[PDB]
Amino acid sequence: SRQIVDAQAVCTRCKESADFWCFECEQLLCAKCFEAHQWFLKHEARPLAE
Amino acid sequence: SRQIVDAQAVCTRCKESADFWCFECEQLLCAKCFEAHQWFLKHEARPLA
Ligand SMILES: [Cl-]
Ligand SMILES: [Zn+2]
Ligand SMILES: [Zn+2]
Ligand SMILES: [Zn+2]
Ligand SMILES: [Zn+2]
C-alpha cells in the first residue's frame, strides 16, 4: 500500500506539520511526537523529503 | 511537500529492503547501496531504526 502525503500533511497525534513517516505504525508524525515515538517504540521510520 | 510513502521501506535505487536514509540525497538505501554511497560521498545519514 503506497500512500500520497500532501504538502500540508499533519501529525497524526497533534496539529503540527508532519516530518516523519513510521513504516510499522503507518502514520505521520511531527518532530516532537516523533521523538516520543522513538523513546517508546523501536520502529523503522524515515524523515519525509523536504 | 508532495511525496509517496510505502508500507515497506525499500531502496530508492534497487528496490531491495532499505536500511538507511540520507538527508542530503533524500533517499532510502539498502546496506549495499549505502556502502557505495559512502565511497563516493560524505552526507548526513542515519539507519532507519
Ligand atoms: Cl517510503
Ligand atoms: Zn511506529
Ligand atoms: Zn505531533
Ligand atoms: Zn539498493
Ligand atoms: Zn547522500
Residue numbers in the entry:
A (entry chain B): 119 to 168
B (entry chain A): 119 to 167
Q: What does the paper behind this entry write?
A:
The ProMyelocyticLeukemia (PML) protein, also known as TRIM19, is the core component of PML nuclear bodies (NBs) that are tightly associated with nuclear matrix. It has been reported that PML NB can play many instrumental roles in DNA-damage responses, apoptosis, cellular senescence, and angiogenesis, etc. Previous studies have shown that the integrity of RBCC domain is essential for PML NB formation. In this study, we also report a previously unrecognized B1-box polymerization (n > 4) that is essential for PML/TRIM19 nuclear body assembly.
